[PDB]
Design a protein around this ligand. Structure first.
Ligand SMILES: *[C@@H]1O[C@H](CO)[C@@H](O[C@@H]2O[C@H](CO)[C@@H](O)[C@H](O)[C@H]2NC(C)=O)[C@H](O)[C@H]1NC(C)=O
Ligand SMILES: *[C@@H]1O[C@H](CO)[C@@H](O)[C@H](O)[C@H]1NC(C)=O
Ligand SMILES: *[C@@H]1O[C@H](CO)[C@@H](O)[C@H](O)[C@H]1NC(C)=O
Lengths: 665, 425, 234, 231, 431
């Protein structure tokens, strides 16, 4: 029931009715959440009276002592959440003028006093929410000049009145929010009277096209920059909807979840500069060629799930006329995730210039094959990143990417691709760095496959079922700057020695879950297959779960830089001696769930020089002194981290020591 | 004579010392070939000296068989004390058992004996022989039960442990089959029975030898009893020169007949019924039939006889050494000896002798010549016992009847045992 | 409408050859892979491999490789599975299944009828059985052994033998007939008995007589040893 | 003296062949019947096969019938045993002996050679364990089955239904929770490690055993049986 | 009526029919005791039938050898074609390798041969006659090796397989013991030696008979080189032979066995333990047997009756039980291919040179020591290069000379062991 002291005081879930009085004086932070308090023991706090932080959570207090604030004048922040008080006097706040932040959550304050906040001026943020009110009155005269953030969510204000807001004339609110407060009418001139309002947030308030157009008129010639409005049942718009808004300078907008239906032509012609624009979770069936006329200054557009769901019975066919984007001359980021566009036309993206990033994941209901001119419309823009996952593509023809010159990232994974790479499909690419092709059906490799892309740096082929991979000229040969390669889960059978030759910049390799056990077995005709030579840069190597049972000593001859190596899930029992000698700097190892019985220092001679982590959790140990002695002694005398050392490391071979913790000799 | 003219086995002393030296050298240096050529020398050399000694003792020449008995006892005593080395025993065993010289000996004697008889008198003498042994069995059983009552031992134990094993054929037949029948019927332990039977029968065998030796002088004292020849009271062509060839033909016949009998008794006709036939019972009948066929010339018949005599008078002392060494374990006799066993086993045999003699006289056979053949050749231990008994009393012309009385009697005894085990309990 | 038909069931003794044919019609058959699945009696399913009829590229599970092969012929629309060493414990139901395959969001399998293969060992028995009795006998130097052996039927003409085998060595003959002795054996071993019961006694144990003894019969064309009993010192 | 020395191989795969040979020096090899005898570790002896002189008669033990061949060549005093399609449980020491009939049964023995059969382990095998091993209920009941995977397999899972006599032949979920067209009233869900199958209300036909497979590796692995819905 | 009365092994035909039906029955039912009693029956029957065919043949009997050679050929062919059942092969090898009947046979022949020579003749022979025999062997050896170098055959082959088997006592005693010694000392196979020696021996037998007549014609053309059937010249004989008792009971024959076995035991002991190697070489015990029996004859312990006793026994083994032994010899020794491979022109000419070399050596050695040369050849080089005692009544009958039968007997009987001793020495020395 003690409280830990780390320059802060934690009192949570102690369900104690009285504050602790044993707290050291020099601490300045107290936490009283998940506890019940009745009244203010100014005495207990006066013991320290140096706290600058103070929070009481889920606590119901009927009243507050006016004298504690002079008792503790060093306080800066206060949180009152789920507090039973609903009518407070300025008398309590006579000496509380040194606060900077005040939270009043879940208090059900039906009515405000006359001037309860006149005394204080130094606070910055004051949020009141989950309270029942009907007026914006908070003070008889103008005061509270130094407040920036005011929150009035979850309240019952009905109509804005200019006389209500006259107090903040001397100040300028940075961002006000009135969400979840059903409002119907606006007094003319109310926004002008209060002063400059940079950011206005209204959400989940029913307005409708008629009332919103009235609102747009009220906001003319006001110092607003961020207008957010959501869940307002804005089905459709006309040009007159935002006519009055053209007399200001906005920079951001929000129309999410408004279930918008149709936009008329030139509806957004009143907004010259609008840096950001969100448009998602709405139901549009048809986009007109001039519906987007007027947007010169736009940098970031979002269209995720902003179109009608396809339905054959409905035959909705959400369709876009081409040349509809020819007005966004400054766009740099576009999104079209999770729509049902039927296909790509020949002039869909005509006009875009500063485009740099385009995502089309799960966008088209039916895109079966890529043609000569499927991307002809995108000729004239410097596109860097393209995204084409989850589109059930089925086959790619040659000369498909000729248009994209500056492209450097291509993602085609998670599709339905089976064909033979003739090598002509990468024809136009010039500066690509990475290509993803994981999670597809099958590819057929040839010698003349990747010769057209010598600048590649990343290649992911995970669960792809490669065919004809063991050709005499290695199909990976033309690549030379490659650093990362993945071939996991493909269940590969055989490999030639020279499949990795002429590659020196390889950093990571990964071959887990493949079937390569046969090759390394000594009885193999032609001897063991050495596919690892000349790799003078390897850092991480993974060979989990291949079925190995025998390791020739001559495999890690060239591995001068190995840092992490994994060999779990195999069937290793007795690795040969003096195999890890060349490994100068090894910082990890993994041999879990193998069939190793005994540990000897000759094999683990240079391996155990300095390790950061080790893992040999499950093995059938023979805990007898002939070999296990080195391990038991070394474990006691070494500081290399071995998690779960006590429990999982067990032996059973000595019948007497069957199921015995090897930790205790 | 002279101290240098005394002859040992027809050899002068200076020559005999030459062989004695060789025997001693072979013993002390421990070198000996373990086959025929290294087994005949030992047996010849030992037998010669110990059979020449045994005919010159004062009391041991008349009442007990001079040569054939002393060698028989001395060899067993030698093996008892461990005087013999391992290799000498292993070579004598090779000559006597593995190569089966004994079977060859018996076959030669039988063939030589039957062919020389007149064809007209074969069956007439045989038709009366069978009831004599039946009379002898009853004569034995009466005395057995009487002495058991005197000792108070229950009659069932007597008839199950003493009388039947004594009257049995021997170890090969009459020891194992009795164990099998007893264990199968009474369901009690088997291994224990075979231990006591194998001792009781040898104890009876020794007394059989001694009593058969006494009968010779008994018959000498009273001439009207012993016929000294054929056992029938009522009975009381020429050959050219015999060259070597008619001696070898007699050896070819003696090994063809045995092969035929073996084939018949192993594959063709194993058993007439409850009686299982030993493969010497057939051989007598086969040779008799061959004689009745008249296929053989009168010169072959005379030729076989000479080979029989050669085997019977020179190579006899050789056999006794092997018989003593192999088929007589004095250890069990010593371990299982007691007063009661000796008394009962010495009364049973004399009871059988009286019974067989009386039965023989009822049907006109010579009493003495009929007690040796039936009742003594019955009580002893199979073929070896037959040879020792017949050699002690110097009657080797009767080997034909001994095999009958042994094998056929054994079969009858097994039948009787099969009946009586169930009947008495 | 798609169909898969296989050949009828059959039974073979341990043997070197079997072929199961899977025939399907109603579709191209040159655009879909074909796979093979085996279910042991009353057990779960197991995977073996698949083939692509277009160009005869094959992939196997690790276990089945080296004893099975898969091939197919386009002209007849047929696929073949072949066994090279049939053996025991391979008796199970066999299926061929078409597989509508891509990365995600498809119908991964659509099966066929199934074939049954049974590998009968074949009739045997008819062998006289030998049973040792005093297993693991324990004694001290100076006493007797008295082992025992018992047979199912009557061994004809007393054909039986006893060996011993010291650890890490070949056996050695002791009693070649039921009663006789080999050349080298001493004069304390002895055996007896006939019919269906036999014994073997050692009169006086010695330090070098501690090993395991067997029981061998050779009457018919089918020799049959028994198990061994052990003689060690407390 | 009499000596018989034999030599051969060891460590063969579960399918393959091998040859053994032995040489005789001390006696007349010709005119002698010969035998092969094997002994498994810690086990009793066992007969294998035998041959006359001239190879006239050959007999085999029943266990090795049809897979073993025996022959001899007199001029080199050598005896061969040929093994084809060796399998497991034949690992043992092997002896060659001489059979001498009545005059000694098995007089001369060799030293013996050792043969062992390989037995490797499985490779890629993400393990999947079903939870309720069996479940019995009545018409109109809601049931729930559970599947657990060793490692993370994301949204790549499917369920099958096998009637007691016929082939499974019925996938029910293409991916996790996507029906294959025909059936109704079925449902599934889950992601990552664990997954769940629930039926709203049983029907007379829905009395069989189910299954679940994964598809994150080209070496597919089916479930270890599944709840047998009965009664 | 040849169908009734014709004799086979001294038996009328119907009796042999009964003796053969038994063998056929035994073969059919596959029942046979494996011991002496089982072996002798099936050896006696087969030998008896197949010896008569060989003996009663026009050219075979007088020249090739007749009864014994046919038997061991027919038996070997039966083994080769696989007629015998396994049980019969075992029952034949058992009495020949485990019961060791062969050693008994050889011992009895050697003892009977050497113990029968008269003591005075043996003592007198050590001065004049034995050296001619030795010089004959020496003379033949050099001719043999000289002609061998012509045809490119190495020395160790000629001296070991060609010149020694010729100067033995035939295959009965002189070609089987040689094979036993060859297998014992050297250690290789013995089928080869016997198979390739028997052919050369039988070949040289012919040239002996042929050269007899040529020597007779030469002795007719020239005069001084010959005598008139008189071995020695300018000598007189006054010796009166002692008389045996004239009756030989069975007891003496039995005594014959005792001496025969005992000498074997003594030789075995001395060879194995007392004097394993007098020089670098080691002596096989057969040579010790020969020396011991010779010494026993020299000392004079044995009575004149016992001497004749061992002769009657050695005639029972060598006339009746030989046809039994040849079946075993055929089964265990013969290799049929070697006999065929060893018949060629070179083998004929070599054997024809060796004999003339022996004759020349004996002739030149006789003249140094009194005897007439031409009659010192017939009794020292021709009478010795034969099939033992079988051909001595043939060679002398080819000429008109019968008075030299005693010298012929001495040659065969006593030189049957000298060559054995020399063979032991040479086998030891060369390899
Ligand atoms: C609103 O946008 C539409 C989008 O298609 C535009 O339509 C074109 O403008 C001509 C003007 O005469 C109309 O007659 C046709 O509907 C359209 N022409 C073609 C060639 O498609 C136009 O900006 C607006 N709509 C209308 C009806 O004017
Ligand atoms: C942008 O609009 C605001 C609206 O309050 C106005 O104050 C400001 O002067 C305008 N800026 C320009 C450059 O027109
Ligand atoms: C825009 O709205 C005006 C009314 O304010 C209307 O007259 C005009 O036709 C509209 N222009 C379009 C839809 O392009």
């Amino acid at each position: 029931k003690c409280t830990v002291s780390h320059e802060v005081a934690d009192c949570s879930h102690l369900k104690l009715t009285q504050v602790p009085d044993d707290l050291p004086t020099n601490i300045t932070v107290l936490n009283l959440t998940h506890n019940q308090l009745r009244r203010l023991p100014a005495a207990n706090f006066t013991r320290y009276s140096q706290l600058t932080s103070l929070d009481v959570g889920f606590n119901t207090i009927s009243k507050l002592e006016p004298e504690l604030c002079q008792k503790l004048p060093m306080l800066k922040v206060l949180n009152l959440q789920h507090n039973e008080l609903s009518q407070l006097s300025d008398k309590t706040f006579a000496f509380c003028t040194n606060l900077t932040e005040l939270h009043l959550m879940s208090n059900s304050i039906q009515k405000i006093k006359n001037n309860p906040f006149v005394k204080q001026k130094n606070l910055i943020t004051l949020d009141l929410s989950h309270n029942g009110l009907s007026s914006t009155k908070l003070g008889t005269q103008v005061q509270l000049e130094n407040l920036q953030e005011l929150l009035l969510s979850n309240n019952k204000i009905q109509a804005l009145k200019s006389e209500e807001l006259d107090i903040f004339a001397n100040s300028s609110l940075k961002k006000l929010e009135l969400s979840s407060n059903q409002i119907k009418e606006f007094s003319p001139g109310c926004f002008h009277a209060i002063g400059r309002l940079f950011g206005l947030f209204l959400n989940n308030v029913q307005l409708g096209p008629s009332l919103t157009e009235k609102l747009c008129l009220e906001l003319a010639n006001t110092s607003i920059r961020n207008l957010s409005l959501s869940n307002s049942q804005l089905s459709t718009t006309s040009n007159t909807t935002f006519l009055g808004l053209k007399w200001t300078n906005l920079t951001m907008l929000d129309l999410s979840y408004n279930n918008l239906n149709v936009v008329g032509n030139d509806s957004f012609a009143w907004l010259p500069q609008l840096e950001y624009f969100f448009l998602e979770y709405n139901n549009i069936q048809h986009l007109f060629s001039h519906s987007l006329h007027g947007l010169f200054n736009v940098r970031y557009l979002n269209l995720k799930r902003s179109f009608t769901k396809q339905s054959i019975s409905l035959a909705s066919l959400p369709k876009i006329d081409d040349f509809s984007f020819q007005w966004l001359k400054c766009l740099e980021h576009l999104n079209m995730e999770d729509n049902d566009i039927p296909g790509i036309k020949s002039n869909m993206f005509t006009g875009l210039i500063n485009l740099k990033y385009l995502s089309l994941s799960n966008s088209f209901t039916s895109l079966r094959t890529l043609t000569n001119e499927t991307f002809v419309s995108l000729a004239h823009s410097p596109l860097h990143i393209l995204n084409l996952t989850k589109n059930k593509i089925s086959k790619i023809e040659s000369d498909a990417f000729s248009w994209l010159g500056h492209l450097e990232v291509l993602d085609l994974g998670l599709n339905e691709i089976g064909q033979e790479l003739t090598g002509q499909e990468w024809r136009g690419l010039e500066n690509i760095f990475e290509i993803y092709l994981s999670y597809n059906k099958y590819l057929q490799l040839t010698r003349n496959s990747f010769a057209l892309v010598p600048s590649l740096q990343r290649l992911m082929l995970r669960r792809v079922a490669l065919k004809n991979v063991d050709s005499s000229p290695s199909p990976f040969q033309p690549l030379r700057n490659l650093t990362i390669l993945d071939l996991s889960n493909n269940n590969i059978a055989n490999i030639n020695d020279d499949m990795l030759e002429g590659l020196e910049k390889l950093e990571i390799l990964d071959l887990q879950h493949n079937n390569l056990a046969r090759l390394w077995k000594h009885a193999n005709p032609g001897g063991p297959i050495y596919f690892l030579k000349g790799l003078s840069h390897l850092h991480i190597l993974n060979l989990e779960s291949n079925g190995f049972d025998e390791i020739p000593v001559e495999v890690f001859k060239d591995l001068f830089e190995l840092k992490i190596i994994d060999l779990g899930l195999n069937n290793l029992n007795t690795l040969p001696a003096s195999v890890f000698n060349n490994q100068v700097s090894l910082k990890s190892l993994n041999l879990q769930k193998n069939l190793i019985t005994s540990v000897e220092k000759k094999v683990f001679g240079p391996a155990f020089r300095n390790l950061t982590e080790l893992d040999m959790r499950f093995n059938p140990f023979d805990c007898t002194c002939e070999s296990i002695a080195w391990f038991v002694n070394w474990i006691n005398e070494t500081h290399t981290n071995i998690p779960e050392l006590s429990s999982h490391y067990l032996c059973n071979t000595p019948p007497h020591y069957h199921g015995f913790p090897v930790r205790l000799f | 004579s002279d101290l240098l003219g005394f002859k040992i086995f027809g050899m002068p002393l200076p020559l005999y010392a030459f062989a004695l030296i060789t025997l001693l050298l072979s013993h002390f240096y421990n070198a000996l070939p373990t086959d025929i050529v290294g087994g005949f020398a030992i047996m010849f050399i030992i037998g010669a000296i110990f059979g020449e000694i045994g005919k010159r003792l004062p009391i041991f020449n008349k009442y007990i068989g001079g040569a054939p008995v002393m060698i028989f006892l001395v060899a067993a005593y030698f093996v008892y004390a461990g005087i013999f080395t391992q290799k000498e025993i292993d070579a004598i065993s090779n000559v006597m058992d593995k190569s089966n010289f004994l079977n060859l000996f018996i076959a030669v004697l039988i063939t030589g004996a039957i062919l020389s008889v007149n064809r007209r008198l074969l069956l007439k003498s045989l038709l009366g022989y069978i009831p004599t042994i039946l009379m002898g069995i009853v004569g034995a059983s009466i005395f057995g039960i009487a002495i058991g009552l005197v000792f108070g031992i229950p009659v069932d134990r007597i008839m199950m442990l003493y009388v039947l094993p004594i009257m049995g054929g021997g170890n090969g037949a009459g020891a194992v089959p009795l164990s099998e029948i007893y264990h199968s019927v009474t369901g009690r332990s088997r291994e224990e029975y075979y231990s006591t039977a194998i001792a009781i029968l040898t104890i009876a065998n020794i007394f059989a030898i001694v009593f058969a030796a006494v009968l010779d002088i008994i018959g000498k004292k009273h001439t009207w009893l012993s016929g000294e020849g054929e056992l029938v009271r009522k009975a009381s062509e020429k050959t050219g020169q015999i060259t070597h060839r008619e001696t070898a033909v007699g050896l070819v016949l003696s090994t063809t007949c045995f092969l035929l009998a073996y084939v018949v008794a192993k594959k063709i006709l194993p058993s007439i019924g409850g009686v299982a036939i030993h493969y010497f019972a057939w051989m007598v009948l086969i040779v008799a039939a061959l004689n009745a066929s008249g296929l053989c010339s009168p010169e072959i018949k005379a030729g076989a006889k000479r080979l029989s005599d050669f085997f019977s008078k020179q190579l006899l002392w050789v056999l006794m050494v092997g018989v003593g060494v192999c088929y007589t374990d004095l250890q069990e006799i010593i371990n299982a000896i007691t007063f009661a066993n000796v008394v009962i086993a010495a009364i049973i045999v004399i009871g059988a002798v009286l019974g067989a003699a009386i039965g023989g006289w009822l049907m006109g056979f010579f009493p003495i010549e009929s007690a040796i053949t039936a009742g003594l050749c019955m009580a002893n231990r199979g073929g070896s016992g037959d040879l020792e008994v017949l050699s002690a009393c110097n009657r080797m012309n009767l080997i034909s009847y001994a095999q009958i009385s042994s094998r056929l009697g054994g079969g009858i005894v097994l039948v009787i045992a099969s009946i009586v085990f169930g009947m008495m309990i | 409408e798609v169909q898969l038909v296989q050949s009828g069931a059959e039974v073979k003794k341990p043997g070197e050859s079997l072929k199961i044919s899977c025939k399907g019609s109603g579709y191209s058959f040159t655009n879909y892979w074909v796979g093979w699945v085996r279910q042991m009696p009353g057990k779960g399913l197991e995977w073996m491999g698949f083939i692509d009829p277009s160009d005869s590229y094959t992939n196997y599970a690790d276990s089945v490789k080296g004893r099975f092969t898969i091939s197919a012929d386009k002209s007849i629309s047929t696929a073949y599975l072949q066994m090279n060493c049939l053996t025991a414990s391979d008796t199970a139901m066999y299926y061929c299944a078409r597989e509508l395959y891509q990365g995600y969001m498809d119908t991964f399998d659509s099966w066929g009828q199934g074939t049954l293969v049974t590998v009968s060992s074949g009739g045997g028995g008819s062998d006289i059985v030998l049973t040792q009795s005093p297993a693991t006998l324990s004694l001290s130097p100076g006493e007797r052994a008295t082992l025992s052996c018992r047979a199912s039927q009557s061994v004809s003409s007393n054909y039986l033998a006893w060996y011993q085998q010291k650890p890490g060595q070949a056996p050695r003959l002791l009693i070649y007939d039921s009663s006789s002795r080999a050349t080298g054996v001493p004069a304390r071993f002895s055996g007896s008995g006939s019919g269906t019961d036999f014994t073997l006694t050692i009169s006086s144990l010695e330090p070098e007589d501690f090993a395991v003894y067997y029981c061998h019969q050779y009457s018919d064309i089918s020799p049959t040893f028994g198990q061994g009993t052990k003689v060690e010192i407390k | 003296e009499v000596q018989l020395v034999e030599s051969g191989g060891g460590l063969v795969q579960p399918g393959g062949s091998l040859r053994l040979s032995c040489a005789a020096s001390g006696f007349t090899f010709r005119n002698s019947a010969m035998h092969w005898v094997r002994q498994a570790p810690g086990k009793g002896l066992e007969w294998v096969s035998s041959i006359w002189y001239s190879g006239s008669n050959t007999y085999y033990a029943d266990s090795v019938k049809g897979r073993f061949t025996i022959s001899r060549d007199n001029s080199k005093n050598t005896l061969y045993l040929q093994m084809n399609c060796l399998t497991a449980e034949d690992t043992a020491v092997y002896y060659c002996a001489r059979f001498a009939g009545g005059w000694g049964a098995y007089d001369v023995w060799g030293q013996g050679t050792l043969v062992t059969v390989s037995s490797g382990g499985g490779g890629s095998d993400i393990q999947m364990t079903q939870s309720p091993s069996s479940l019995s209920a009545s018409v109109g009941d809601r049931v729930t089955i559970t599947a657990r995977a060793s490692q993370s397999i994301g949204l790549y899972l499917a369920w099958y239904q096998q009637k007691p006599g016929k082939a499974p032949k019925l996938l029910i979920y293409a991916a996790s929770s996507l029906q294959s067209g025909v059936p109704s009233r079925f449902s599934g869900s889950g992601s990552g490690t664990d997954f769940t199958l629930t039926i709203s209300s049983l029907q007379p036909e829905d009395f069989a055993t189910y299954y679940c497979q994964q598809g994150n590796t080209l070496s597919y692995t089916f479930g270890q049986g599944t709840k047998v819905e009965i009664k």
